[PDB]
Design a protein around this ligand. Structure first.
Ligand code: CA
Ligand code: CA
Length: 266
């Protein structure tokens, strides 16, 4: 089907990058209506691949989610990281931002002249979203548009909107998060999602609010689990199930808590 790349291994997933060289396309904030960002897309590939929007969502961010761009794109995804300081803020605006970003990728995908023209399978959209962008991600997951959601230290005001999420959703919770404390955000958000949904809750041990952003102490977990999430759900690549369903995740030092609804794709 949509499988791409070799049979995965942990080292393959935890390597600083995936196999593909990644080219980038800078998106000015003046186009797309999502604050600008960077499209990351692999070279050397053929066929279409899933597209992932990676959105920040912490206005006073000292750093952002850009690690996800090259990291995820290098495994065979078109991955657009959205810039910070976009004028977007609260989770509802972040959902709008995500939708605008997804529109933009699809629009560029549909262009004959985009450097990644035709590279995106519009049916296979993922969103990784941090903080209020994680709330936005959960909101877009609830809107039914996307095929995989990875809220990173999500912040939102209510879990009720998430009670019917059917989108495969991996929430990276950050154990020590004081911005979006897990007990008030990532945890109840995760628990709001039906147990019928393919979902995972990975609380990263001692994680600050930034713990899911990558380029940090959690690269292994974020890469191994997050890339697997996208592979499994966006590519229907069952070869990545082994990293998500099977392992005793909490045995990992870096994973303070795991919840999930394995098996997936039943
Ligand atoms: Ca701890
Ligand atoms: Ca299940």
């Amino acid at each position: 089907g949509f499988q791409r790349g070799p049979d995965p291994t942990v080292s393959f997933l935890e390597a600083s990058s995936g196999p593909y060289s990644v080219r980038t396309d800078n998106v000015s904030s003046l186009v797309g209506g999502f604050g600008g960002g960077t499209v990351h897309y692999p070279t050397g590939t053929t066929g279409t691949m899933a597209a992932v929007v990676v959105i920040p969502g912490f206005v006073s961010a000292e750093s952002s989610i850009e690690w996800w761009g090259p990291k995820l794109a290098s495994y065979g995804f078109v991955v657009m990281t959205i810039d910070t300081n976009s004028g977007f803020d609260q989770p509802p605006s972040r959902a709008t931002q995500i939708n605008n970003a997804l529109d933009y990728l699809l629009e560029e995908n549909d262009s004959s002249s985009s450097p990644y023209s035709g590279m995106i399978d519009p049916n296979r959209l993922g969103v990784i979203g941090w903080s209020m962008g994680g709330g936005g991600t959960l909101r877009v997951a609830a809107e039914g548009r996307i095929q995989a959601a990875i809220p990173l230290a999500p912040w939102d005001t209510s879990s009720l909107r998430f009670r019917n999420i059917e989108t495969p959703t991996l929430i990276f919770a950050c154990e020590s998060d004081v911005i979006a404390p897990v007990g008030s955000h990532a945890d109840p958000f995760y628990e709001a999602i039906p147990d019928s949904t393919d979902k995972a809750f990975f609380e990263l041990n001692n994680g600050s609010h930034y713990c899911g952003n990558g380029g940090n102490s959690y690269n292994n977990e974020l890469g191994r689990l997050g890339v697997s999430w996208m592979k499994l759900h966006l590519d229907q690549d069952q070869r990545y199930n082994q990293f998500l369903c099977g392992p005793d995740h909490e045995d990992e030092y870096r994973i303070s808590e795991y919840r999930g609804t394995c098996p997936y794709l039943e």
